[PDB]
Design a protein around this nucleic acid. Structure first.
Lengths: 120, 48, 43, 110
RNA sequence: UUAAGUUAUUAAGGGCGCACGGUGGAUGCCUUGGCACUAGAAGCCGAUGAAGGACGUUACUAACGACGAUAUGCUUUGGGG
RNA sequence: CCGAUAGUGAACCAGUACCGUGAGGGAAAGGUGAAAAGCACCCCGGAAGGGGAGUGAAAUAGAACCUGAAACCGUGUGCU
RNA sequence: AUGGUAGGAGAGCGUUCUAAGGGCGUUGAAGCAUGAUCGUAAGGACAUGUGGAGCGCUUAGAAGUGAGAAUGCCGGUGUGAGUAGCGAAAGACGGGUGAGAAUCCCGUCCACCGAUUGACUAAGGUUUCCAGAGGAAGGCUCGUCCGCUCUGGGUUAGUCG
RNA sequence: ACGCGAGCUGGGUUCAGAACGUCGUGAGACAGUUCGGUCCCUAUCCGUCGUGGGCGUAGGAAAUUUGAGAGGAGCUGUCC
RNA sequence: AGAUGAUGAGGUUAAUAGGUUCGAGGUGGAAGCAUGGUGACAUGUGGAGCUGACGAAUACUAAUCGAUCGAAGACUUAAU
């Protein structure tokens, strides 16, 4: 698997940060390799959310960061709550996938292959 | 470790014959706008 | 590592400086030289 | 009928600008613009500015049609260099080089 | 058509020549400044505060010159218009 | 006698930038045009730059401004 | 008769200047560039482009009178080469500004120092301090940012030193 | 190049220190002993190990092959 | 398979990679509930639960629409 030019702990932390931000925003802009790695992470999180049980909730809290969303109608929830409420309902019938990568052009400061990754 | 003779123009420009840029693909965007980069929905009007 | 010239305004003006040059005949000669050469600063 | 544009004292080295200049020489203007948009090099937008200035000169001052033009000449020459004493290393010198870019565009007639 | 033989065409790049450009500041022309001397005055100041400077002074202002709280100058005699 | 690598170290910002704790050492750097008439206006461009137009005898005389050598860097081609 | 190094003798070519004479020049001088020209050599003309004010010729006379080498001096410019290097360290996403954003602002998360990467006071430095404006140069990349540039402001003591 | 330090050590010897013995009026010496004592280099050309691009081979291609040559291998024991 | 580039497996008439499901192997008995124990703890539900690179299956996701390059079997002689 990919190392992403980082150490083990840095990689783990960045992956779970990416996954949390994706659950928050539903589309994010990043590099190709990071997207190709975080894909599996977020898909496994959605699988846990579809299972729905307490043990899966805890095994997902192992990964997700504790973040508060400002929901419409002045409501507030967590990424875990969103994952287990809405994102599981949207994909209750879908078997796999849940994410799509769309390539964009290179950045300026680098020649890095930029990419959007979006929930479907 | 150091060069014993200077390099001539001939040798220099011979060495610089594989030092160039290739050409991109340029599949012309059938949807709209500027020409899209291949397999890339380009930010500047691409529809790949 | 420690380097030469640890500055000090007092010691500068005391070992160099106008009054110290004028206190001795040979220090009055360096001023005459700098004046003759046209030096903008004498001390 | 030829329309020309030159950009003087660009802070990029001629060796670097010539690499991308070599791709557009002898091309049509539209495909050259496309190549410059799809190349990721620092000199591409600069050369694009020069090319579009030349085409605008052709359209305004000579009343030529921009649909049937080709890049006839495209070159970079050396400008004056700037000397900088690199303090980071050990008392070394660094020449910041610069280029005079020129492109001329023609309809291919007389 | 089959054998045997001969001999091309390509320029990724390079060489020579020619043309056109850029860089760079030699060459020519010039002088605002200097070098060596001639002749004729003078040979230099200072406690009535010198040689040298520092701070300031223009309506606007940095530098240099001029000037000094009467400050980018004051009075007066004589030229000039 | 020199005519800007010359001739004073200094034709210009000179015993100044700069170096050195200090005594001291000590540079580089001249030329638009007769006249500033020093490019109104339009176009590309964020601007710099430029292309026209115009001043001028001349603008490859446009302030990086007389002449503009060679090294060096390029673009085109005839022979190979 | 005519190979020739140390070396001796002789005859000459060019450079700057001076005297005299005689000439050339905006109908374009010197310089620069090119050429398939002349002379036994040093070297001399002519033609054409560029340039835009001084310069040849004859005879004689004076010299700062001829460079390829001195690990020579001073300036320009190459080669190595798109090479080595870009100076210890955790960043990710979103939103914003903008011609233009990995590098600037804001927000959330994460992480680091923690008898210190914290907070004061001396020495030293001397306006680097604060608001706006700016991207030509500086910043080992970028830059809308800045200890950089421009404009204007800012240091208040009977008890502190 | 008593093969090989721009491939490695640095035990030896020999540079500054110090000591024993001997010699020397002495400063010091022996080379007779003893403890200690800084080993730089980003590979231009040839060369070598691998690995690609271009062109050629009388039409253009995919695949399977011959083999002029070249390299490798080559040791030995005990027991019935 | 590999420094890059090459090489090979695949490009929707598709199992190339990912995900999903199920396995293999690895670890070794999840959580929750109940019971016993004063309590540390233990027992059962239950070879449990978890599982990177390995295997199979399944088009849920992505391998899109496209564009470029690419020949025109000479001449001479002898046989036919």
């Amino acid at each position: 698997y990919r190392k992403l030019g980082r150490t083990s702990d840095q990689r783990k932390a960045m992956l779970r940060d990416l996954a949390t931000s994706l659950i928050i925003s539903e589309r994010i802009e990043t590099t190709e390799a990071r997207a190709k790695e975080v894909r599996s992470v977020v898909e496994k999180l959605i699988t846990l959310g579809k299972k729905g049980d307490l043990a899966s909730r805890r095994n997902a809290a192992k990964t997700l960061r504790n973040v508060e969303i400002l929901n419409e109608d002045e409501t507030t929830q967590t990424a875990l709550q969103k994952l287990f409420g809405e994102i599981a309902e949207r994909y209750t019938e879908r078997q796999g996938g849940y994410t799509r990568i769309l390539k964009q052009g290179p950045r300026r400061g680098d020649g890095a292959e930029s990419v959007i990754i979006e929930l479907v | 470790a150091v060069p014993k003779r200077r390099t001539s123009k001939t040798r220099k420009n011979k060495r610089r014959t594989h030092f160039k840029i290739s050409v991109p693909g340029m599949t012309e965007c059938p949807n709209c706008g500027e020409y899209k980069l291949s397999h890339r929905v380009c930010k500047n009007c691409g529809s790949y | 590592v420690k380097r030469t010239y640890q500055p000090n305004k007092r010691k500068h003006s005391k070992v160099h400086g106008f009054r110290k040059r004028m206190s001795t005949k040979n220090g009055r000669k360096v001023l005459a030289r700098r004046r003759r050469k046209g030096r903008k600063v004498l001390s | 009928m030829e329309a020309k544009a030159v950009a003087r004292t660009i802070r990029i080295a001629p060796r670097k600008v010539r690499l991308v200049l070599d791709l557009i020489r002898g091309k049509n203007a539209a495909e050259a613009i496309a190549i410059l948009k799809l190349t990721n090099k620092a000199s591409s937008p600069v050369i694009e500015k020069v090319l579009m200035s030349a085409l605008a000169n052709a359209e305004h001052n000579y009343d030529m049609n921009t649909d049937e033009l080709v890049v006839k000449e495209a070159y970079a020459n050396e400008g004056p260099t700037l000397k900088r004493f690199r303090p980071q290393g050990r008392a070394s010198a660094i020449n910041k080089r610069t280029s005079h870019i020129t492109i001329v565009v023609s309809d291919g007639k007389e």
